[PDB]
């Protein structure tokens, strides 16, 4: 969170993928125009993403499902 | 002035080339915050010249390290002045003593 | 260096100060005592902790 | 460049053949000016201030 | 002299015995001042009633033991210190405590009257081990402020008390532990001033916010000799849940509320469709919608114009 | 021009914005550690006593 | 309860610089309450009158030199901090000072005013040495509390003063240094009762009785937080409409500056000009009309 990253690497298990699951995650509010799922708490998005992980709703896999289903709502939408 | 001194100041402050050393003596005739007019003692005097000395102090002027070198008077109006005195102080000097 | 003196001054055992071996009920009221001047820091007592 | 040329075209602004090299205070300095000193070349004219 | 008086912003209360009462801002040199100048009150000078004297039958001193009791006499003396009480109108009340049964002796066991107020009835005072023995003691309550332990109390009580009468370190003040701090506070150019943060936990028999009212009075009383848009408003007159304010406005080329508010009800009512009863159906409209007599409209007409 | 809103736009940004502090010679891996600022008004840098 | 309220008792005024105030009654511990809590308040927030702006003719800046004066000019500004002057009513008084010939310009060389009370007129300000030495300064005296340096006034006021106005920092605080003691007060039936002597030593300008009357005035008001509290269209000009060349030849012939000045007139007040459907087209779009009367106009 604001001070440490222990309680999120208890979930992720690595000191670099917690950066990498949030390097992927924390662009969607800078230029992606989206909103988080937790209470915002006036936070900069490099910890808003860290909040979403350490609230147990995000690992690397569950990010990969919302990025798949976005593409199959543009694929037949053209046709 | 410093309270725990070492008896070295009024030799090292004098011979530092920053104060005014009384080559001759006499009484202070004219004293100013610009320069000092002193009149030569008559047993110190010479039959050629009249015997009136002037020392133009060097006011607010830079140093190399961008600090200030102003010399300051410390003498009084109409007072006896020995030879070899501290007529006008240096910048960091107090009455002839080093005051860092 | 600074705190490691002050911790050593805080926890000490001087045999003489005041209130040697009196009763206490909590470390809150231990700080009722020293802040009142009615005791000292380093003086042995009989207490309760949880 | 033709954007600025159009800005020249709207307002008719004619920046001359003159270019700025003004000696300014290094920002973050306070104080008071205690001397202006002038060194002019030999034979060349002199101005009203000097 | 244009002093920066504060406003209290907040209490952060944890439970019914605890609070953190912050503040911002003060000037430098009064934040450290007040946060100490109250702490000398809450230690020594807050008036309350406490347990003072202790009388049990069949005892001689507290170093001794009592069979049928789990604990020591000192630990039972310890409990009455952690006991909370409130004598309302009297100035010296004595109570009794008699039990039987296998188990603890909670603070319901005191024979009280209506002027002595225990806040914590679950407070155990003794434990009976087996059914045989029992506790029968008498305890005494006195009023004062601060703290006096029984060391210097017997230096101040020169009574040659008979054997069997005990004395505890009285807890007169209600404050159990308070602390305070100083952080920095900002006014939008001056980031030099100091906030006040105070942490406070007291016992029962009080509100944790009532003390800072009560104790800061007493320091001050010492000083008195020293200071001496709407949706149907986008909608014509036929659809506003009314019917004699609808049919007779559109026949002056005002088909809507628009020029109704600029035009004057001395002429719009003088036209041969309205009159002296329409002002109940225009001015009551202008009560809820706020518009005036002659008002300039910000954005009235859209592209749509129609009728019925 | 050091104008009025300039501070309180900066004050929003440096909240939850990390920063580095490095001392030469950074003689081991803890010679360069991240920090988070809390802006003071002055001309020098205040450090935590256990770093 | 058995509380006891104090009285101001004694003003044993030892000097015009050195003083002593006793105080009684005080209970146990409340000596350290009211011995301490005044002292931190007393050392900072006392309003006094102090020198701010000394200005001499013929001296351009604080690093210049003037002849007939024995002293350097910054040092004379450092002399002029130590001035105790008791001013009563206003907050700004401009003293004036003159002298001629040999002789030290001291603090007894001011043309005095009525509510001006110099405390210490014997203080040395300068030492004129020449016969034609004639100094002349135009000093602003103010009245304030706290500390203000020179650079604080600089940024806070963008207004530019004339040259030669040589500032001095604002040492307002007219207390110097105090101490106090806790001894016993002799009241018979309450033998624990304690007295308090507050020796106050300072400069002039302050009667030490009123120093504490204002000091409790400071403290007893910060307890009051505790003893109580727990149209853009209207100003739009004529050229924004991309309006027709014939009617802009007329609205500039009918001498109307703003659109609020146009609707100050009505539709009838436009028809007399040669060379209504256009304004009835465009005013109905962006939220306007005609015939609307304006009052309390203009608002500049």
From Swiss-Prot, chain A:
It comes from the Bacteria. The keyword Nucleotidyltransferase applies. Keywords: DNA-directed RNA polymerase, Nucleotidyltransferase, Transcription, Transferase. SMART domains: RNA_pol_Rpb6. InterPro entries: DNA-dir_RNA_pol_omega, Pol_omega/Rpo6/RPB6, RPB6/omega-like_sf. Pfam families: RNA_pol_Rpb6 (PF01192). The keyword Nucleotidyltransferase applies. One of its GO terms (cellular component) is cytosolic DNA-directed RNA polymerase complex. It catalyses: RNA(n) + a ribonucleoside 5'-triphosphate = RNA(n+1) + diphosphate. PANTHER family: DNA-DIRECTED RNA POLYMERASE SUBUNIT OMEGA (PTHR34476:SF1). Promotes RNA polymerase (RNAP) assembly. Latches the N- and C-terminal regions of the beta' subunit thereby facilitating its interaction with the beta and alpha subunits. The RNAP catalytic core consists of 2 alpha, 1 beta, 1 beta' and 1 omega subunit. When a sigma factor is associated with the core the holoenzyme is formed, which can initiate transcription. The rRNA transcription and antitermination complex (rrnTAC) consists of RNAP, NusA, NusB, NusE (rpsJ), NusG, SubB, ribosomal protein S4, DNA and precursor rRNA; S4 is more flexible than other subunits. This is DNA-directed RNA polymerase subunit omega.
Swiss-Prot record, chain D:
Co-administration of salinamide and rifampicin or salinamide and myxopyronin suppresses the emergence of resistance to both antibiotics. Acetylated on several lysine residues in the presence of glucose. The RNAP catalytic core consists of 2 alpha, 1 beta, 1 beta' and 1 omega subunit. When a sigma factor is associated with the core the holoenzyme is formed, which can initiate transcription. The rRNA transcription and antitermination complex (rrnTAC) consists of RNAP, NusA, NusB, NusE (rpsJ), NusG, SubB, ribosomal protein S4, DNA and precursor rRNA; S4 is more flexible than other subunits. In pull-down experiments interacts with CedA. (Microbial infection) Interacts (via flap domain) with Escherichia phage lambda antitermination protein Q; this interaction renders bacterial RNAP resistant to transcription pausing and allows it to read through termination signals. Belongs to the RNA polymerase beta chain family. DNA-dependent RNA polymerase (RNAP) catalyzes the transcription of DNA into RNA using the four ribonucleoside triphosphates as substrates. Resistance to the antibiotics salinamide A, salinamide B, rifampicin, streptolydigin, CBR703, myxopyronin, and lipiarmycin can result from mutations in this protein. The gene is rpoB. The chain holds residues 896 to 945 of 1342 of the full protein.
UniProtKB/Swiss-Prot annotation, chain F:
Acetylated on several lysine residues in the presence of glucose. It comes from the Bacteria. Signal peptide: none annotated. Co-administration of salinamide and rifampicin or salinamide and myxopyronin suppresses the emergence of resistance to both antibiotics. Belongs to the RNA polymerase beta' chain family. DNA-dependent RNA polymerase (RNAP) catalyzes the transcription of DNA into RNA using the four ribonucleoside triphosphates as substrates. Resistance to the antibiotics salinamide A, salinamide B, rifampicin, streptolydigin, CBR703, myxopyronin, and lipiarmycin can result from mutations in this protein. The RNAP catalytic core consists of 2 alpha, 1 beta, 1 beta' and 1 omega subunit. When a sigma factor is associated with the core the holoenzyme is formed, which can initiate transcription. The rRNA transcription and antitermination complex (rrnTAC) consists of RNAP, NusA, NusB, NusE (rpsJ), NusG, SubB, ribosomal protein S4, DNA and precursor rRNA; S4 is more flexible than other subunits. This is DNA-directed RNA polymerase subunit beta'. It comes from Escherichia coli (strain K12). The chain holds residues 403 to 453 of 1407 of the full protein.
UniProtKB/Swiss-Prot annotation, chain G:
GO terms for cellular component: cytoplasm; cytosol; cytosolic DNA-directed RNA polymerase complex; membrane; transcription elongation factor complex. InterPro entries: DNA-dir_RNA_pol_insert (IPR011262), DNA-dir_RNA_pol_RpoA/D/Rpb3 (IPR011263), DNA-dir_RpoA (IPR011773), RBP11-like (IPR036603), RNAP_asu_C (IPR011260), RNApol_insert_sf (IPR036643). It holds the Pfam family RNA_pol_L. The keyword Metal-binding does not apply. The keyword Nucleotide-binding does not apply. It is an enzyme of class 2 (transferase). Keywords: Acetylation, ADP-ribosylation, DNA-directed RNA polymerase, Nucleotidyltransferase, Transcription, Transferase. Its EC number is 2.7.7.6. Gene3D superfamilies: 5' to 3' exonuclease, C-terminal subdomain (1.10.150.20), DNA-directed RNA polymerase, insert domain (2.170.120.12), RNA polymerase, RBP11-like subunit (3.30.1360.10). Changing residue 40 to C: In rpoA112; temperature-sensitive, blocks RNA polymerase assembly. One of its GO terms (biological process) is transcription antitermination. GO terms for molecular function: DNA binding; DNA-directed RNA polymerase activity; protein dimerization activity. The modification ADP-ribosylarginine is found at residue 246. It catalyses: RNA(n) + a ribonucleoside 5'-triphosphate = RNA(n+1) + diphosphate. Residues 157-160 are annotated as: Required for interaction with Crp at class II promoters. Residues 1-230 are annotated as: Alpha N-terminal domain (alpha-NTD). Residues 231-300 are annotated as: Alpha C-terminal domain (alpha-CTD). (Microbial infection) ADP-ribosylated on both alpha subunits by the phage T4 protein ModA. ADP-ribosylated on only one of the alpha subunits by the phage T4 protein Alt. SMART domains: RPOLD. Belongs to the RNA polymerase alpha chain family. This is DNA-directed RNA polymerase subunit alpha. It comes from Escherichia coli (strain K12).
């Amino acid at each position: 969170a604001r001070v440490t990253v222990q309680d999120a690497v208890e979930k992720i298990g690595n000191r670099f993928d917690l950066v990498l699951v949030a390097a992927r995650r924390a662009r969607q509010m800078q230029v992606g125009g989206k909103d988080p799922l937790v209470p915002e708490e006036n936070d900069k998005t490099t910890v808003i993403a860290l909040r979403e992980i350490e609230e147990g709703l995000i690992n690397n896999q569950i990010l990969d499902v919302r990025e798949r289903q976005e593409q199959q709502e543009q694929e037949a939408a053209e046709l | 002035k410093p309270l725990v001194g070492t008896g070295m100041e009024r030799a090292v402050a004098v011979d530092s080339g920053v104060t005014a050393v009384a080559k001759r003596g006499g009484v202070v005739q004219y004293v100013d915050a610009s320069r000092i007019v002193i009149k030569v003692n008559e047993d110190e005097m010479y039959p050629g010249e009249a015997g009136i000395d002037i020392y133009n102090l060097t006011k607010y002027t830079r140093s190399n390290q961008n600090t200030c070198i102003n010399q300051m008077p410390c003498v009084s109006l109409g007072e006896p002045v020995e030879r070899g005195d501290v007529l006008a102080d240096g910048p960091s000097t107090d009455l002839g003593e080093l005051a860092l | 260096q600074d705190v490691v003196l002050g911790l050593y001054y805080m926890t000490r055992d001087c045999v003489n100060a005041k209130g040697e071996g009196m009763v206490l009920t909590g470390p809150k009221e231990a700080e009722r005592l020293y802040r009142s001047g009615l005791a000292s820091l380093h003086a042995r007592v009989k207490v309760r902790i949880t | 460049t033709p954007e600025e040329k159009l800005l020249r075209a709207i307002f008719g602004e004619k920046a001359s053949d003159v270019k700025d090299s003004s000696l300014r205070v290094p920002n973050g300095v306070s104080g008071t000016v205690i001397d202006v000193q002038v060194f002019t070349r030999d034979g060349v004219e002199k101005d009203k201030r000097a | 002299t244009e002093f920066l008086k504060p406003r209290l912003v907040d209490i952060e209360q944890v439970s019914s015995t605890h609070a953190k009462v912050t503040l911002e801002p003060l000037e430098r040199g009064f934040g450290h001042t007040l946060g100490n100048a109250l702490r000398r009150i809450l230690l020594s000078s807050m008036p309350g009633c406490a347990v003072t004297e202790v009388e049990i039958d069949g005892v001689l001193h507290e170093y001794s033991t009592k069979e049928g009791v789990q604990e020591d006499i000192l630990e039972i003396l310890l409990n009455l210190k952690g006991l909370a009480v409130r004598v309302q109108g009297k100035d010296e009340v004595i109570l009794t405590l008699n039990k039987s049964g296998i188990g603890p002796v909670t603070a319901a066991d005191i024979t009280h009257d209506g002027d002595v107020e225990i806040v914590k009835p679950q407070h155990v005072i003794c434990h009976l081990t087996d059914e045989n023995a029992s506790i029968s003691m008498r305890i005494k309550v006195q009023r004062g402020r601060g703290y006096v332990p029984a060391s210097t109390r017997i230096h101040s009580e020169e009574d040659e008390r008979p054997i069997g009468r005990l004395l505890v370190d009285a807890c007169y003040s209600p404050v159990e532990r308070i602390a305070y701090n100083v952080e920095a506070a900002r006014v939008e150019q001056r980031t030099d001033l100091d906030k006040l943060v105070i942490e406070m936990e007291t016992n029962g028999t009080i509100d944790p916010e009532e003390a800072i009212r009560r104790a800061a009075t007493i320091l001050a009383e010492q000083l008195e000799a020293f200071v001496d848009f709407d949706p149907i408003l986008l909608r014509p007159v036929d659809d506003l849940e009314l019917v004699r304010s609808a049919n007779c406005l559109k026949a002056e080329a005002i088909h809507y509320i628009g020029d109704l508010v600029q035009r004057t009800e001395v002429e719009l009512l003088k036209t041969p469709n309205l009159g002296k009863k329409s002002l109940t159906e225009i001015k009551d409209v202008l009560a809820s919608r706020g518009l005036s007599l002659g008002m300039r409209l910000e954005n009235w007409p859209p592209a749509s114009i129609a009728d019925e | 021009r050091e104008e009025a809103v300039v501070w309180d736009i900066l004050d929003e940004v440096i909240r939850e914005h990390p920063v580095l502090l490095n001392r030469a010679p950074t003689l081991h891996r803890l010679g360069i550690q991240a920090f988070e600022p809390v802006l003071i008004e002055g001309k020098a840098i205040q450090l935590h006593p256990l770093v």
